[PDB]
Amino acid sequence: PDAMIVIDGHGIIQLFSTAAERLFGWSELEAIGQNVNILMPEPDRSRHDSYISRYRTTSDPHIIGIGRIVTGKRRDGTTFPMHLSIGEMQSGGEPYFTGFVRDLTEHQQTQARLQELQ
Ligand code: HEM
Numbered sequence: 333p334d335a336m337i338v339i340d341g342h343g344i345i346q347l348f349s350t351a352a353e354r355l356f357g358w359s360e361l362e363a364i365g366q367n368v369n370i371l372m373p374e375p376d377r378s379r380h381d382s383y384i385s386r387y388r389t390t391s392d393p394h395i396i397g398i399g400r401i402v403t404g405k406r407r408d409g410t411t412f413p414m415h416l417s418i419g420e421m422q423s424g425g426e427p428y429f430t431g432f433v434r435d436l437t438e439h440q441q442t443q444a445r446l447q448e449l450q
Pocket residue numbers: 337338339368371372373376380383384387392393394395396402403404405416418429430431432
C-alpha cells in the first residue's frame with residue numbers, strides 16, 4: 333500500500349491511511365478535514381490550492397499520470413523526500429484525488445553517505 337491520502341476538489345483530506353499516520357505524524361482524526369498543504373513546506377504549501385485549481389480549469393496534468401519526487405513535511409517539522417503518484421476519481425459528482433506516497437528518505441540517506449565517502 334504505502335501512504336495513501338484522498339482529497340476532495342478543494343485539497344481537503346477525506347481519508348488518511350494508517351501508513352500515512354506513521355509517515356506524517358498526524359493521526360487519522362487530526363488529518364481529515366485539514367487541507368493537504370499541511371503535509372508540505374513553503375512555497376508549495378500556499379501555492380498548492382492554486383496548482384489544484386489550475387489543473388481543474390486547464391485539465392493539463394503536471395504530476396497526474398507522471399509521478400514526481402518532492403519534499404513532504406511531518407508534524408514535528410522535519411522535511412523529507414518522497415515519490416508521489418496522484419490519481420483522479422469522481423464520487424457524488426465531485427472530483428477526488430488520491431495520492432500514493434513512497435518515503436525516499438532511506439534512499440537519499442544511502443546516496444549522500446556513499447557520496448561523502450568519495
Ligand atoms: C505532500 C507533499 C506534496 C507536495 C510537495 C505537492 C506538490 C505539488 C506540486 C509542485 C504540484 C504541481 C506543480 C507543477 O508541476 O505545476 C502539485 C499538484 C497537485 N497536487 Fe500535490 N503535492 C503534495 C501532495 C499531494 C497529495 C497528497 C495530493 C492528493 C491526495 C495532491 C494533489 C495534487 C493535485 C490534484 C495537483 C494538481 C495535479 C496536477 O498538476 O497533475 N498533492 N502538487
